[model samples]
Each structure stands twice: as C-alpha cells, then as structure tokens.
Target: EHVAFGSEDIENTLAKMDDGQLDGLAFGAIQLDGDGNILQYNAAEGDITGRDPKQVIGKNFFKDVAPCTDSPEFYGKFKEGVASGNLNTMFEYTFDYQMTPTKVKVHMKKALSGDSYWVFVKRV
Candidate 1:
C-alpha cells in the first residue's frame, strides 16, 4: 500500500531489496497551496531529495525543489489545468541524474479540501 495520499508501484524495485533495507517505491507526493507553495510531501519524496520534509514543506515548488518547471511551458500548462478544474492530468518528463535518465509520469488531482492540489509521480 502507498503511504502517501497518492499511490505508486514499486513492486519491481522491491524484488531487489535486501532484508531490513529501507527501500521501496521511489516516488513523489507533492501538495501545493493556492499560492503555489508546497504544503506537503511524503517520506518517499523526501527520500528522493535527501532533504527533510520540514525544509521543503512550506517552500515554493518552482522556486525551490524544481526550478526546471518554473518555465512557461510547464507553469502555463499547469495553470490551464487548474483553471479548468481538470480532475486528472498526465505529464511526462525525463529526469537525468548520475548519468541515468529516467522517464517519469505524473498525475495531478485537486485535494478534497479544495484549497490545495496533489501531484504524484513514478518512474516509467
């Protein structure tokens, strides 16, 4: 089961895990407030950045964790989706780290409170 509000499948990765190793799905669960500041992130996501959740929880997503998404292409599309109240949207991007390029698929949904939004991703 996913620990966060969003879900990710890490069954394949778990096949390689050794006993007692703190390894599971490598995924991100990000919640953004109306002002675009990050409001929440799950442990799996904090593990990915190697940063404590407290440090990133209240920071602006584009200004801090993901500067690459600050560009008009991404933000513009995000804004359109938000304005339209789109229940779900899929985004594809390539993340290159340590000479490894991973394709990621992200899904976005409005939170139940209606004051924030939730986004979840997994390597594809």
Candidate 2:
C-alpha cells in the first residue's frame, strides 16, 4: 500500500528513483523549497490536484496555489521541520479546493541537505 512508502525514508528513496520511476509510483509526489515554492511536481500530483506542474513549478504552493494547505497544520509543520532540521511524518488530511473535499494520506519529508522538502499524497 501507499503507507509502506510513506513510512520509508523519503529523501533516500527520492535520491534513488529516477523521474520515470518516481512518476510511476502509486502516489502523488511533490517537491518544494522551505519557502513553499513548488519545484518538482509529478504527473500523479498534477492529476490528483487538478493543476498542471508547469503552472505551479515556480509558484508559492502554500500561498498562491493550494491555500487550503496554508494553515498551521500543514504549512506550520513544514516550517517547524525546516527550523528543527528534521521532518518525516504522515497523517490523514482533507484537501478542500474548488472541488469536493478529498481525503488523502500525506507523507512529508525534509531533505537531509536542509534545502527542500517532499510531500507524498495518496487518496484514502
């Protein structure tokens, strides 16, 4: 299941997976900076979120794009992870955009290099 990958070391896993492999995974994967700027957004994430990667790659994910996740629960944890230098967690969340509220399992991980973070999401 997706939870298995959610429990693995995401930074290490990402370092191992190529673009095609990452995109072929059973979950949506997104990469962003500590500042919430979208970097690497895969096809699964685009399909799940209904937003093109090209449209969001340079945008602020928490601010301009997915404002629903801008709250303290999501973005706050991201900031805390960046500040504390460790972030690897998973939880269930509901993403309510213009469409219906979609329940999802979210796995968050901060890179060991401290420069960026990754979010893996799977519908639950």
Candidate 3:
C-alpha cells in the first residue's frame, strides 16, 4: 500500500524503506543529515522543485539547494531540533520558484537508525 502524504507514523513508514521505494511515495521526500546535506533525493521531490536528484544529492539542502529555507523559521527550527535530538516538526512553508509560489505542508522527522532526517512536502 502507498503511504499517503499526510499519514501518521510517517517516520516509521520511511524508516522501513532503505534501498528503494522512496521514489514511489506520493509526496516529495528528501533525506538530509543534521548539517542539511542532501542524502536521498527522491523523484517526487525532483518533480516538486524541478531539480535533478543526481545534481542535488550530497549537496547542502539549506545553503546549496534551497536558499529560501535559510530563514529562521526553517533553519533555526532544524538546528534547534538537531541540538535537542528530538526532531519531529511540521509547518507550512512556501517554495518560491520558477516564477510561481507553491505553498506546501512540510514535515520533518528524525530517523530511528541514523543521525539524519526526512523532509516531506505536499502542496497545500
């Protein structure tokens, strides 16, 4: 079964998929480290941002990938959670790109297996 964008226990769902299945998700999925390095950039995220996953993987999400997320609301919150080691957060954010602003629901979840996080995005 496909996991819905707004599904609960999303973290567990994500944690279960390792080698593949991420690209099949209905929502945009980005795997990032504590320092915002992009780890696993899925196809849905590529579709949402019009970015090539091959180019963005291993790059910094906040600085190199998306400068719009460098603000206090996003970067600050991310740092705060990383510091506390409790990173389960959700917020509404706008991705201003390609001459159009897309309002989205953003969900950040810390991984159970490693020092990384999952960022999920869905249009609002």
Candidate 4:
C-alpha cells in the first residue's frame, strides 16, 4: 500500500510536479527578449489570462500585462538578479483578477540562449 507522506515528502512531491515536462501541463512559459518584450508565450498561459500570446508577444511586459512589476517593489529585486546574471528565483504571489482568486508560484530563470529569460508559473 502507498504510505502517507510527511511535509518534506509533500514539498518534494510539489517540486516534482514540474518534472521538466510541458505536455499535459496546466502551467505555461512566457519567454521574453533581453529587453523584456514578450516573444513566445505558451497556450496554457494564454488560457489562464484570457489573452492569446499572439496578442501578447512583441509587447513590453513592464508596460503591459503587469504594470506592478515596474514598481520598485517587484522589479527592483528582479532587476538585481537579472543584472547580476543570477539564474533562478522563486516567489509566491496572489493575483485577484476578474474577482477570481488565482494563486501562483512563479519561477524566474535565465534562458540557455543567453539573450532571453523565462517566467514559469504553476497554479497553486
């Protein structure tokens, strides 16, 4: 029989949810150019936000999508990581858009291409 697990196991399980696979994923990837212009946003993200990536790509994220990221509160920390070439960072945020509580855990990581970055999200 499968045994019940503890918090550490639960955490590991949650982390394993990603498993480096995108198929059958409810999560999505938002790829951005070095200047933060949306390049490739996945279908799941479009579905989540009710906007297609075709509409989002070529737009500046700091000016569109989430202006809050422009504020010192968020961008300040993010810019530091980017400027320092730091690879990955994680944080929890709650977005109450359209009166629907959408909780998310966001992971920001540098792309292997060296000229882009990826914002990966998983709904909590």
- Model number with the top TM-score: 3
Model 2 per-residue lDDT at 65: 82
What TM-scores do the predictions have? 0.67, 0.88, 0.92, 0.71
The digit string of per-residue lDDT tens for model 1 on 1-124 reads: 2243243433223234332232243466677876578876766665544557677778887666776667665555666767877645667876543334556676776665566666666766
Clashing pairs in 4: none
The residue-by-residue lDDT of candidate 3 on 1-124, one tens digit each, is 5898757778788888853699888899998898999989888888888898889999999987888999999888889988999988889999985537888899987877678888899888
- Pairs in steric clash, model 3: none
Clashes per candidate (backbone, < 3 Å): 0, 0, 0, 0
How well does candidate 1 match the true structure, expressed as C-alpha RMSD?
Answer: 7.6
Q: Model 1, poorest ten-residue lDDT window? A: 14-23
Q: If the candidates were sorted by their TM-score against the true structure, best first, what order would they fall in?
A: 3, 2, 4, 1
The digit string of per-residue lDDT tens for model 4 on 1-124 reads 1212122232223323332332234566676766778877777776666666678779987677766467664556567667888647667776554436677777767665666676767777
Q: What is the lDDT of residue 63 in candidate 1?
A: 67
| Residue 24 Cα positional deviation in candidate 3, in Å, after optimal superposition | 0.3
> Which RMSD values do the candidates have, in order?
7.6, 2.3, 1.5, 6.9
Task: Compare candidates 1 and 4 on TM-score and give the better one.
Answer: 4
Give the candidate order by descending lDDT: 3, 2, 4, 1
Q: Which residue pairs in model 1 clash with each other?
A: none
TM-score between model 2 and native? 0.88
Return the lDDT, model 3, position 68. Answer: 92
Q: Highest lDDT: give the candidate number.
A: 3
